[PDB]
Amino acid sequence: MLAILYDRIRPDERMLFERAEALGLPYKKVYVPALPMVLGERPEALEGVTVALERCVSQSRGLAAARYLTALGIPVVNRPEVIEACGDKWATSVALAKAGLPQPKTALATDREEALRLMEAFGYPVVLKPVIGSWGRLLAKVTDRAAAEALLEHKEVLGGFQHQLFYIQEYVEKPGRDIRVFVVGERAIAAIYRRSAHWITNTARGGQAENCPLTEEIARLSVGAAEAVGGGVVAVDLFESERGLLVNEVNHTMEFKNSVHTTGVDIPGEILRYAWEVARG
Amino acid sequence: MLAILYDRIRPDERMLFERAEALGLPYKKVYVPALPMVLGERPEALEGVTVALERCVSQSRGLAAARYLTALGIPVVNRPEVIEACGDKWATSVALAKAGLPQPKTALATDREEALRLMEAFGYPVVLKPVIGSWGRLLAKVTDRAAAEALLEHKEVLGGFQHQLFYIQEYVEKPGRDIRVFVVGERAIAAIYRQAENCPLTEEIARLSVGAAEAVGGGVVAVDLFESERGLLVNEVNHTMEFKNSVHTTGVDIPGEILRYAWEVARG
Amino acid sequence: MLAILYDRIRPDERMLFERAEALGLPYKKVYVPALPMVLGERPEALEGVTVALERCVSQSRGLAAARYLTALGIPVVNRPEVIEACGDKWATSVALAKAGLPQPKTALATDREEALRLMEAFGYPVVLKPVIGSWGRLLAKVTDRAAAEALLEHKEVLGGFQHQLFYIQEYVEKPGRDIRVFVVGERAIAAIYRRSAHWITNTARGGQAENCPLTEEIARLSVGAAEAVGGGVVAVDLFESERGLLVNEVNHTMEFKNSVHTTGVDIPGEILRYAWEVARG
Amino acid sequence: MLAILYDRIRPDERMLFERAEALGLPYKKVYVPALPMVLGERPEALEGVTVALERCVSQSRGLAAARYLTALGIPVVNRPEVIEACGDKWATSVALAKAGLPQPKTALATDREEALRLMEAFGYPVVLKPVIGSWGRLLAKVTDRAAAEALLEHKEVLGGFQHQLFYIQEYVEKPGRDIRVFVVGERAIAAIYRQAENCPLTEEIARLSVGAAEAVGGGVVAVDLFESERGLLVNEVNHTMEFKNSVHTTGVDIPGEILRYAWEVARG
Ligand SMILES: Nc1ncnc2c1ncn2[C@@H]1O[C@H](COP(=O)(O)OP(=O)(O)NP(=O)(O)O)[C@@H](O)[C@H]1O
Ligand SMILES: Nc1ncnc2c1ncn2[C@@H]1O[C@H](COP(=O)(O)OP(=O)(O)NP(=O)(O)O)[C@@H](O)[C@H]1O
Ligand SMILES: Nc1ncnc2c1ncn2[C@@H]1O[C@H](COP(=O)(O)OP(=O)(O)NP(=O)(O)O)[C@@H](O)[C@H]1O
Ligand SMILES: Nc1ncnc2c1ncn2[C@@H]1O[C@H](COP(=O)(O)OP(=O)(O)NP(=O)(O)O)[C@@H](O)[C@H]1O
């Protein structure tokens, strides 16, 4: 049986339930917060479970649960190695550099002094990001030294250990949008332009979205980024820069609720077929 | 040649510096907080470096630097995968379970009510640990429900989301000491009881320690064992071992063995 | 006009709106998160406002807003002095000691070593509380030295500055319940028994409630506690101990949604009449 | 007689100790972290104490001790009400507004979107402060919306609920210095520019400083002023003044004046 692991039901999960039924896939939902995860002891909720789709909103919960399923010998999409690689921006950027994929100039400082040096060397504006976090949390477009000094002080004084690694990236001049590509295994299945006047292009900051036709370069880059972080089912974010397409981020738990209408592609169905027909083995 | 990555020089790093010199091993010390880590730009400090020993006191700095060196095609001891796995007690316990290695009964909950239900099923006393090292601060032996309830709320309310993962373990009755085993590759080279005394290697200690090291991906690690009534149990695997005193205690050339290992790792 | 200041509408606030209409009181609701609080400049939402009832769930928001209203010369129930005194358990206990009101033995430590000494001197079980917090947050019944050491370590390692003051109180053996008294000015208007098997007697931990008839001692103590913290409209919590009634806590923003049915007393109406007829002047 | 409440002895506290001795003033030093503060049990350390000077470096410890001494009927300099009011910049600004004292244009928001709307209406640059002292860490001069957006999110996401109160203030153009005035009761006794130099008292400095001290409830406080194009503006009022260097800079017996004040406060 397919288990859909979750903590909060979003419309994306509701769509997954609907397609599983329409497809005649034997499935059940598993509420991860109530799941006892004792090593050596399969909990009641997972008896009969033959493959799992990890759909938790909390990535630390999602990752702990993915790890647990691997301990029980149940295949999980995505694998913990993929979730871990996607959940740490430095691990992602390192993986992309190794794969030889194009990305914005990217650097890591482990103290305030190095972080300032780098931002000055990159030149303003420059982007500062937390290494761990999601949904565009705590990103900063830093436009001068005093904004830089103040952000770093807030990270040091208020942030935990994680916020003491400073992820510094060239600010990329985008043409009012970015690209998100939905990758299922070795295929790019669909893509969107996310258009906004705000440098953070999400729906919530006054942004809109349209179909992004797959081009040979968009598909090649996206699938390559997906392979770089360990494969599976992922959303790849790209920027159109002056020097060509750059890979920005890879997301382990992709949202698609509006994008199935935008693209006309059966994204939840592709996800479910991948889990049932390839991950399950 | 070798680079030793460090942030604060401890006596352990000086012994490595002094053993390398004594061995006539070409090496440089690389101060990570000042190392420029720009992807696609090899820094001057890493020119001609063929292997690195990750010796940072900060594990998150150490991991970040290890990843960087892998992007440069420089083998690092330990590999980022090993550091990652050792640094998360749930990742370690899962790897141990998958390798079939003995360990205390262990569970994770992601929610206070389930964590409380689990603690209740384990029975008191039960141990609660943070999943991400402290280095050892927040561990509690919890002896009843009221203590359990309060600690779980404190973790949740006060702690980062990191403290929202509740690592629950059976309390193991044992002889008021632990065994720490120094593993270098496929060999246990030395062990201590922790006034720490030498712990002569046995077949059981050697087999289980190397097994635990392999389970987390292999390398240079310290493995902690419990002497339980049901046998030796793996507690934790540490990615950056301290050995300053244990060189005297065990009479084993721990730093020499580490550097010899790093030299073979240099091959690719 | 009466302004009801709020951040999240609970059933208590809904009842307040209903009684204000039934009473023909000119009133409006003011959503504090959207309220611009510029000193020297009355915002649009407060034009015509003649008295305010502070009903925010967040006590730091509620207090900031109460302070603001005083800067505009608008009477507010409760006054900031009352909110501040009720919101800090040490300030409350100090005020009760000065008033000569009976309370559990209570002490404050400002470091781990003093906190341990006190708990050992009080003897287990002993209660440890944060000085600031509400709705029974972070309370601990501490039953031995190792539970004590572990709680103090979590406070020190994970808590901010506030959690570095340790409020230590004798554990009071209660008869399976505590008393809450609703005080409006110089009158105790109603009271409840809060019954539970859990030492924290709230609804959420499996507790129930019944009418607590007002006795001369219950009324005298409750009104006296109310005066001790600066007066106004407050809920006073008492314990029946072996040495008589003790005052535990005074609450600046009382909840009463179930208690109007339990007691048969028009609690929101009394609150509204106090604000309109006495605080407004 | 006098008790001086302290936690860490700074040069300021030694000068107080040494002035009291020189004055022949009977006093004791009371180490607050070891002071038993049990309500209803006067501790031995406070026997015969008729007034206290609150000199703790930690303001939350200092406030807690001040409250305790008031329960004992011992007058404290400063009173808990004054410490409380000085320690919260929104409480201070509100007290200043109510007293009709000049200050920079100041606003509070409790929500990021409203805070951003306010910053936008003030116009850039604008100052963002934490409401609860740092002692001075987190203050930002914010020069545009992007910087504003990021700082507000960092405060909200990373900070305690204390950082969910957004204290917004007009940026004041001023001559690259501030004035700090030492107020003892109804008198300004000395002032500095802050290589801090003496700032001779004037009528304007004296009037506004004593007014600010009275606005927060009166006592022994340092008042910070801005020399703006529209006059002197009150910035902050500090409940535990430091004066070690300023005794030399101003040539005023600051500690003597503080102790004289404490002696009159002893009367009730
Ligand atoms: N270096 C950069 N230059 C320009 N724009 C950037 C840069 N980094 C991020 N952005 C924008 O900021 C947003 C968030 O990116 P990021 O947080 O790195 O990944 P993400 O969380 O997957 N994206 P989102 O869906 O917005 O949360 C995207 O809309 C990007 O276009
Ligand atoms: N499940 C358990 N049962 C009994 N004792 C335990 C258990 N887990 C840990 N301990 C004990 O807890 C103490 C501290 O354990 P731990 O925190 O894992 O090591 P540590 O103190 O971090 N040592 P180090 O790594 O050198 O800092 C040791 O004495 C262990 O014996
Ligand atoms: N010293 C004590 N001895 C026994 N029980 C106590 C003690 N302190 C608190 N309690 C119980 O714990 C609960 C919370 O008290 P406290 O947090 O101090 O005030 P409160 O938040 O107004 N009450 P609540 O409505 O439960 O949130 C009450 O039900 C009390 O009966
Ligand atoms: N609204 C404002 N406009 C211009 N400058 C300001 C404003 N508020 C504060 N400052 C300046 O900010 C700097 C630090 O201010 P502040 O943090 O209030 O004092 P501080 O650094 O804490 N001094 P201390 O109390 O001795 O630690 C000073 O140089 C002030 O001049």
Side-chain angles (χ1 to χ4, degrees):
Chain A
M1 195 166 223
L2 167 71
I4 300 170
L5 307 161
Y6 81 96
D7 49 16
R8 200 217 321 155
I9 304 283
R10 302 161 291 191
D12 318 65
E13 286 70 49
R14 284 190 204 92
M15 291 168 62
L16 286 168
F17 305 151
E18 307 170 0
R19 292 298 286 126
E21 300 167 5
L23 288 169
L25 220 281
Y27 89 102
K28 71 188 293 192
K29 65 212 86 187
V30 174
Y31 182 59
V32 172
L35 191 68
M37 304 197 305
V38 184
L39 294 170
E41 184 185 318
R42 186 184 283 235
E44 187 286 321
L46 300 178
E47 281 167 0
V49 170
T50 232
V51 56
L53 227 215
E54 200 295 280
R55 293 296 306 182
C56 288
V57 171
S58 160
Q59 80 153 20
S60 62
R61 177 173 290 120
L63 175 59
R67 297 198 194 283
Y68 190 56
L69 283 257
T70 71
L72 269 14
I74 305 171
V76 55
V77 176
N78 288 300
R79 295 185 298 124
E81 291 89 341
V82 173
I83 299 165
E84 292 180 306
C86 290
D88 175 324
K89 303 186 184 79
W90 184 235
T92 298
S93 292
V94 161
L96 305 171
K98 290 158 87 184
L101 292 160
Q103 63 199 317
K105 189 170 45 182
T106 301
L108 196 82
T110 69
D111 72 19
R112 155 182 227 106
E113 179 190 359
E114 179 63 13
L116 260 330
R117 195 194 67 70
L118 283 157
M119 299 179 85
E120 222 60 66
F122 280 42
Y124 305 91
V126 57
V127 175
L128 184 66
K129 309 190 191 184
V131 297
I132 296 176
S134 208
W135 304 280
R137 280 292 189 284
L138 296 162
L139 313 175
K141 181 189 179 172
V142 185
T143 56
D144 57 62
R145 178 161 196 101
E149 288 179 343
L151 258 350
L152 298 173
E153 224 221 328
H154 284 246
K155 293 185 185 291
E156 287 195 330
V157 168
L158 307 177
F161 73 102
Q162 22 156 19
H163 298 104
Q164 310 322 309
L165 297 174
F166 307 104
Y167 180 99
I168 296 148
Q169 197 169 68
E170 85 171 285
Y171 176 78
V172 180
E173 287 290 347
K174 306 188 311 283
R177 71 194 188 184
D178 62 13
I179 299 170
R180 172 161 294 171
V181 189
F182 304 91
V183 178
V184 177
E186 311 183 72
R187 292 189 295 135
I189 70 167
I192 60 170
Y193 289 117
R194 301 191 285 169
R195 195 180 74 261
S196 184
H198 202 277
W199 75 288
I200 301 154
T201 62
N202 75 309
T203 332
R205 295 180 197 252
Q208 200 43 73
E210 59 193 68
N211 184 243
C212 173
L214 268 6
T215 67
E216 204 236 61
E217 182 176 26
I218 289 170
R220 186 184 82 237
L221 258 35
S222 295
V223 175
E227 297 172 349
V229 300
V233 178
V234 297
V236 180
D237 293 336
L238 314 168
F239 298 151
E240 299 155 289
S241 78
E242 78 301 335
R243 60 181 167 102
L245 290 175
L246 305 175
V247 186
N248 172 39
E249 199 113 327
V250 186
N251 303 284
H252 53 72
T253 307
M254 60 202 215
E255 292 167 84
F256 50 76
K257 60 137 140 56
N258 283 311
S259 296
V260 331
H261 181 69
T262 306
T263 67
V265 169
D266 176 32
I267 302 172
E270 292 276 5
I271 293 170
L272 266 355
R273 171 169 78 188
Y274 178 88
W276 190 255
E277 306 189 10
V278 13
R280 177 182 178 259
Chain B
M1 94 299 213
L2 173 67
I4 305 177
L5 313 170
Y6 75 91
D7 49 14
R8 207 190 72 235
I9 300 157
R10 296 167 291 198
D12 316 69
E13 285 73 52
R14 298 209 181 78
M15 289 170 49
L16 283 165
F17 300 156
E18 301 167 353
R19 276 310 276 131
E21 295 175 53
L23 283 170
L25 233 168
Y27 83 100
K28 71 201 303 288
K29 31 212 154 185
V30 175
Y31 179 67
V32 176
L35 180 71
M37 295 195 291
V38 185
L39 289 174
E41 299 188 357
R42 172 174 312 213
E44 183 154 13
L46 297 175
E47 279 169 10
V49 172
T50 55
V51 62
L53 191 63
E54 203 289 281
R55 294 299 304 181
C56 290
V57 180
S58 164
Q59 73 171 310
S60 76
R61 172 176 296 126
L63 178 53
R67 297 197 195 287
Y68 189 65
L69 285 254
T70 75
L72 262 28
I74 301 153
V76 185
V77 177
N78 288 298
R79 297 188 290 118
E81 295 65 35
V82 170
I83 298 168
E84 290 189 300
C86 291
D88 180 315
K89 304 171 189 67
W90 184 237
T92 298
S93 292
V94 163
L96 298 166
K98 282 149 85 180
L101 292 165
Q103 64 175 327
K105 190 167 81 201
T106 300
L108 202 83
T110 63
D111 155 71
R112 278 199 286 145
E113 293 181 55
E114 181 53 33
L116 190 54
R117 189 179 284 107
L118 251 20
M119 289 174 82
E120 208 59 67
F122 273 60
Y124 301 98
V126 67
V127 177
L128 250 185
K129 312 196 187 177
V131 302
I132 260 65
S134 291
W135 303 254
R137 307 162 310 191
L138 295 164
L139 178 148
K141 181 189 176 164
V142 1
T143 51
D144 59 57
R145 189 175 183 87
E149 284 178 347
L151 283 164
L152 290 171
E153 188 185 9
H154 282 251
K155 290 186 183 296
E156 171 169 299
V157 174
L158 301 186
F161 33 78
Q162 40 150 176
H163 298 100
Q164 182 74 250
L165 301 184
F166 302 115
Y167 183 99
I168 299 153
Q169 199 176 67
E170 70 169 298
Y171 182 68
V172 176
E173 218 74 61
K174 49 189 194 68
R177 68 194 182 176
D178 295 333
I179 300 171
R180 170 158 294 170
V181 190
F182 303 96
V183 176
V184 171
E186 297 190 312
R187 288 182 317 114
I189 65 161
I192 55 172
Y193 295 109
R194 37 194 296 276
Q195 65 171 226
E197 19 253 26
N198 178 249
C199 173
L201 281 334
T202 56
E203 247 275 359
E204 199 67 4
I205 294 170
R207 174 186 143 254
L208 255 20
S209 296
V210 177
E214 309 280 67
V216 299
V220 175
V221 300
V223 184
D224 297 330
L225 304 181
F226 290 160
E227 295 154 285
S228 83
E229 295 179 336
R230 74 176 153 96
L232 300 180
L233 304 183
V234 178
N235 178 36
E236 282 172 35
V237 186
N238 308 292
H239 53 69
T240 312
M241 56 196 218
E242 287 176 58
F243 51 80
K244 155 60 177 150
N245 297 308
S246 308
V247 172
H248 183 59
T249 312
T250 61
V252 169
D253 183 17
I254 289 162
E257 292 265 14
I258 294 168
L259 305 160
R260 212 220 303 169
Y261 180 83
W263 212 79
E264 94 150 358
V265 156
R267 289 181 197 194
Chain C
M1 195 166 223
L2 167 71
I4 300 170
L5 307 161
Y6 81 96
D7 49 16
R8 200 217 321 155
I9 304 283
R10 302 161 291 191
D12 318 65
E13 286 70 49
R14 284 190 204 92
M15 291 168 62
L16 286 168
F17 305 151
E18 307 170 0
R19 292 298 286 126
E21 300 167 5
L23 288 169
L25 220 281
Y27 89 102
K28 71 188 293 192
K29 65 212 86 187
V30 174
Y31 182 59
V32 172
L35 191 68
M37 304 197 305
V38 184
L39 294 170
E41 184 185 318
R42 186 184 283 235
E44 187 286 321
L46 300 178
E47 281 167 0
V49 170
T50 232
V51 56
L53 227 215
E54 200 295 280
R55 293 296 306 182
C56 288
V57 171
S58 160
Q59 80 153 20
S60 62
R61 177 173 290 120
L63 175 59
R67 297 198 194 283
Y68 190 56
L69 283 257
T70 71
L72 269 14
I74 305 171
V76 55
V77 176
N78 288 300
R79 295 185 298 124
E81 291 89 341
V82 173
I83 299 165
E84 292 180 306
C86 290
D88 175 324
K89 303 186 184 79
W90 184 235
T92 298
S93 292
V94 161
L96 305 171
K98 290 158 87 184
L101 292 160
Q103 63 199 317
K105 189 170 45 182
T106 301
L108 196 82
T110 69
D111 72 19
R112 155 182 227 106
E113 179 190 359
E114 179 63 13
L116 260 330
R117 195 194 67 70
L118 283 157
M119 299 178 85
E120 222 60 66
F122 280 42
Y124 305 91
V126 57
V127 175
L128 184 66
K129 309 190 191 184
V131 297
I132 296 176
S134 208
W135 304 280
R137 280 292 189 284
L138 296 162
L139 313 175
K141 181 189 179 172
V142 185
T143 56
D144 57 62
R145 178 161 196 101
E149 288 179 343
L151 258 350
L152 299 173
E153 224 221 328
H154 284 246
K155 293 185 185 291
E156 287 195 330
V157 168
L158 307 177
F161 73 102
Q162 22 156 19
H163 298 104
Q164 310 322 309
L165 297 174
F166 307 104
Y167 180 99
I168 296 148
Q169 197 169 68
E170 85 171 285
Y171 176 78
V172 180
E173 287 290 347
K174 306 188 311 283
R177 71 194 188 184
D178 62 13
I179 299 170
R180 172 161 294 171
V181 189
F182 304 91
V183 178
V184 177
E186 311 183 72
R187 292 189 295 135
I189 70 167
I192 60 170
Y193 289 117
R194 301 191 285 169
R195 195 180 74 261
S196 184
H198 202 277
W199 75 288
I200 301 154
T201 62
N202 75 309
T203 332
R205 295 180 197 252
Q208 200 43 73
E210 59 193 68
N211 184 243
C212 173
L214 268 6
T215 67
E216 204 236 61
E217 182 176 26
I218 289 170
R220 186 184 82 237
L221 258 35
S222 295
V223 175
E227 297 172 349
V229 300
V233 178
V234 297
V236 180
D237 293 336
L238 314 168
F239 298 151
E240 299 155 289
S241 78
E242 78 301 335
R243 60 181 167 102
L245 290 175
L246 305 175
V247 186
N248 172 39
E249 199 113 327
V250 186
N251 303 284
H252 53 72
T253 307
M254 60 202 215
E255 292 167 84
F256 50 76
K257 60 137 140 56
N258 283 311
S259 296
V260 331
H261 181 69
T262 306
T263 67
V265 169
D266 176 32
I267 302 172
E270 292 276 5
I271 293 170
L272 266 355
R273 171 169 78 188
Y274 178 88
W276 190 255
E277 305 189 10
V278 13
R280 177 182 178 259
Chain D
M1 94 299 213
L2 173 67
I4 305 177
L5 313 170
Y6 75 91
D7 49 14
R8 207 190 72 235
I9 300 157
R10 296 167 291 198
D12 316 69
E13 285 73 52
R14 298 209 181 78
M15 289 170 49
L16 283 165
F17 300 156
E18 301 167 353
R19 276 310 276 131
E21 295 175 53
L23 283 170
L25 233 168
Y27 83 100
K28 71 201 303 288
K29 31 212 154 185
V30 175
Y31 179 67
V32 176
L35 180 71
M37 295 195 291
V38 185
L39 289 174
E41 299 188 357
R42 172 174 312 213
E44 183 154 13
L46 297 175
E47 279 169 10
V49 172
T50 55
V51 62
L53 191 63
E54 203 289 281
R55 294 299 304 181
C56 290
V57 180
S58 164
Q59 73 171 310
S60 76
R61 172 176 296 126
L63 178 53
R67 297 197 195 287
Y68 189 65
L69 285 254
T70 75
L72 262 28
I74 301 153
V76 185
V77 177
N78 288 298
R79 297 188 290 118
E81 295 65 35
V82 170
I83 298 168
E84 290 189 300
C86 291
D88 180 315
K89 304 171 189 67
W90 184 237
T92 298
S93 292
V94 163
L96 298 166
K98 282 149 85 180
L101 292 165
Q103 64 175 327
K105 190 167 81 201
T106 300
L108 202 83
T110 63
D111 155 71
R112 278 199 286 145
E113 293 181 55
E114 181 53 33
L116 190 54
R117 189 179 284 107
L118 251 20
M119 289 174 82
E120 208 59 67
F122 273 60
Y124 301 98
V126 67
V127 177
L128 250 185
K129 312 196 187 177
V131 302
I132 260 65
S134 291
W135 303 254
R137 307 162 310 191
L138 295 164
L139 178 148
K141 181 189 176 164
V142 1
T143 51
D144 59 57
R145 189 175 183 87
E149 284 178 347
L151 283 164
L152 290 171
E153 188 185 9
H154 282 251
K155 290 186 183 296
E156 171 169 299
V157 174
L158 301 186
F161 33 78
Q162 40 150 176
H163 298 100
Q164 182 74 250
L165 301 184
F166 302 115
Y167 183 99
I168 299 153
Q169 199 176 67
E170 70 169 298
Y171 182 68
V172 176
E173 218 74 61
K174 49 189 194 68
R177 68 194 182 176
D178 295 333
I179 300 171
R180 170 158 294 170
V181 190
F182 303 96
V183 176
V184 171
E186 297 190 312
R187 288 182 317 114
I189 65 161
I192 55 172
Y193 295 109
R194 37 194 296 276
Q195 65 171 226
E197 19 253 26
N198 178 249
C199 173
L201 281 334
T202 56
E203 247 275 359
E204 199 67 4
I205 294 170
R207 174 186 143 254
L208 255 20
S209 296
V210 178
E214 309 280 67
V216 299
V220 175
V221 300
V223 184
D224 297 330
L225 304 181
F226 290 160
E227 295 154 285
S228 83
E229 295 179 336
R230 74 176 153 96
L232 300 180
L233 304 183
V234 178
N235 178 36
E236 282 172 35
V237 186
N238 308 292
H239 53 69
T240 312
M241 56 196 218
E242 287 176 58
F243 51 80
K244 155 60 177 150
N245 297 308
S246 308
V247 172
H248 183 59
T249 312
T250 61
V252 169
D253 183 17
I254 289 162
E257 292 265 14
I258 294 168
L259 305 160
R260 212 220 303 169
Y261 180 83
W263 212 79
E264 94 150 358
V265 156
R267 289 181 197 194

